[PDB]
């Protein structure tokens, strides 16, 4: 599923990400964009044999099990295909867990480079919430 910016904004708000653990909603919308480009089904394989899954491009070395990745840790306790669904549910739940560690959103390379420090609230301007 490919999302509109405003359609994702509202979904993420429905899924409790406005102001989750100190992060406002534009943070998640911006990251989704630069990670996956609003596509729930994006997959990207890495040099080290791990893959990133879904709208938030969540990595199989740490967060989920794909049965392909060497020393996988499965911190989110979820198979990586759950992260692919048209529903954003699994992806949000797992991103909530990721962000509850001290690193917070610095886990996402794209977010560090594109969103962090910018006027992220821009990403929710326009939509009825």
């Amino acid at each position, epitope marked *: 599923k490919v999302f509109g910016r405003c359609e994702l904004a509202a979904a993420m708000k*429905r899924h409790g990400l406005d102001n989750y653990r100190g992060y406002s909603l534009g943070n998640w919308v911006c990251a989704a964009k630069f990670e996956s480009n609003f596509n729930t089904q994006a997959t990207n394989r890495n040099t080290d044999g791990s893959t990133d899954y879904g709208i938030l491009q969540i990595n199989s070395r740490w967060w989920c099990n794909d049965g392909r990745t060497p020393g996988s840790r499965n911190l989110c*306790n979820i198979p990586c295909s759950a992260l692919l669904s048209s529903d954003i*549910t699994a992806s949000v739940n797992c991103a909530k*867990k990721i962000v509850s560690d001290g690193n917070g959103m610095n886990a996402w390379v794209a977010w560090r480079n594109r969103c962090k420090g910018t006027d992220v609230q821009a990403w929710i301007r326009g939509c009825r919430l």
Partner: single-chain antibody, 220 residues
């Protein structure tokens, strides 16, 4: 801290009836509200997560709804097994917090706590949680305690990076550490007072797995 007002305080009911329990929050918390059932000191059991999402192995009849600041646990057609306390918990903001409880009167991986059960005032309480079935490097780990008047308190957790979150009411008396090569994690609570008498539970961050709990008394 986000404060969660649960109501009604107690509720009596005939098997077959439907019920609704209410949780209201002092500030907007999105969908970040979870429900537990606890039968007179046993580990709480997670029933609904994130306001309305099902939990695998939990009976159909339990459902939830709401958002923002109004939340409802529904028991469509009550069974006798459903007796006990019910608690809401937020995870939107640190510290995590628990509602005051609603009494309902009807008409693989294991965790184990070890430590003392009697401690002198002013001493350090040390607890161990031994994990079985997976690596402690494969999750986040929490400590929670239940006070004698039913009150529940989230004490803290340690997360993959080794970073830790502690409840500010413990004012720096608390410490949480891991020993990877033993598959253990630890609670240290300095300078105990009679206030600290409670049942202590270890649990993973998900709230899926809980130890059995252990009673610790602080006594002159």
């Amino acid at each position: 801290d986000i404060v969660l007002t649960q109501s009604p305080a107690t509720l009596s009911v005939t098997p077959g009836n439907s019920v609704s329990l209410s949780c209201r929050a002092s500030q907007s918390i999105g969908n970040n509200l979870h429900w537990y059932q606890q039968k007179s000191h046993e580990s709480p059991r997670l029933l609904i997560k994130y306001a309305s999402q099902s939990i695998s192995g939990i009976p159909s009849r339990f459902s939830g709804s709401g958002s923002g600041t109004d939340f409802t646990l529904s028991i469509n057609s009550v069974e006798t097994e459903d007796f006990g306390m019910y608690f809401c918990q937020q995870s939107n903001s640190w510290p995590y917090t628990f509602g005051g409880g609603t009494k309902l009167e009807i008409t693989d991986i294991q965790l184990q706590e070890s430590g003392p059960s009697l401690v002198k005032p002013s001493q350090t309480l040390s607890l161990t949680c031994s994990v079985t079935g997976d690596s402690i490097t494969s999750d986040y780990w929490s400590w929670i305690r239940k006070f004698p008047g039913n009150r529940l308190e989230y004490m803290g957790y340690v997360s993959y990076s080794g970073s830790t979150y502690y409840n500010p009411s413990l004012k720096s008396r608390i410490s949480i550490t891991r020993d990877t090569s033993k598959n253990q994690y630890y609670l240290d609570l300095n300078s105990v007072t009679t206030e600290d008498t409670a049942t202590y539970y270890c649990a993973n961050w998900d709230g899926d797995y809980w130890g059995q709990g252990t009673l610790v008394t602080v006594s002159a």
